[PDB]
A paper describes a structure:
Here, we show that the bacterial R28 protein, which is epidemiologically associated with outbreaks of puerperal sepsis, specifically targets the human receptor CEACAM1. This interaction triggers events that would favor the development of puerperal sepsis, including adhesion to cervical cells, suppression of epithelial wound repair and subversion of innate immune responses. The human immunomodulatory receptor CEACAM1 (carcinoembryonic antigen-related cell adhesion molecule 1) binds to some bacterial proteins that contain an Ig-like fold designated IgI3. The IgI3 domain of R28 was sufficient for the interaction, and the N-terminal domain of CEACAM1 was necessary and sufficient for the interaction, as demonstrated in direct binding assays.
Residue numbers in the entry:
A (entry chain A): 1 to 107
B (entry chain B): 1 to 106
Write the structure that this text describes.
Amino acid sequence: QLTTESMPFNVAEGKEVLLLVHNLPQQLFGYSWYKGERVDGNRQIVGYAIGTQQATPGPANSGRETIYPNASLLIQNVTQNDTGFYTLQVIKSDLVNEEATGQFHVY
Amino acid sequence: TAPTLTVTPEQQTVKVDEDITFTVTVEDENEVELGLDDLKAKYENDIIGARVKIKYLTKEPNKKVMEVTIMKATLADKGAITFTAKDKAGNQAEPKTVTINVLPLK
Ligand SMILES: [Cl-]
C-alpha cells in the first residue's frame, strides 16, 4: 500500500528531486528516510516527529535533504552519489512500522 | 475483570555500548490498549531513527506482546519507563515500570 514516487525519476546533476509518499497511514508517530534498501540508523538521512512537528538530521544528511510533514523528501543540488535506492519507514501510533522504498537515477 | 500487565525483566543492569531488551505483555477478555505514552516520550527520536526497535511479538486485539530493544547503551539510557493498560470498559490494570541501569566500561 505505502508507496513512494520520484519526481522526476531521472534527475540531472545539480537539479532537484522530490520523493512523494502516497498511501500514508491513518494515525502516525513519525517518518524516517534512509539511503539504501534497508532501514539502518547509520544510514538515516532525516527524521520527522509528528508530535514535535520538527525535522532532525541523521548521519547521512548532507544538508541538501529536507523532510516535510507529508512525508515527502526533497534533495537539492543532487550529486552522482545521491543516485540509488532510498527507504522510507513510517512509524505509526501503534509503534508498528510500514516500509516503502523508492529510487531515482542521476544523469 | 482487570487486564494483566507484566514486564520482563523488571530491572536490568547493562554496560555502555550494549543492547537493552525488555518485553511488555498485556492481555484481557476484551480489547486492551497498551499505554506507550511514557515509552514514546523517552525515546521519540530514537524510535524514529531505528536506534530503538519496537517488535510486536503478538498483536491480537485482547493480547499484545511487545519487545523493546535499545541498542548501543549510553549512560543516558539509565532510567525508567512506565506502561499502562486498560480495557474498553475502562478497567485499569496496575501500572508496571522498567528500571534500567547503565555502567561505565571502566
Ligand atoms: Cl494519498
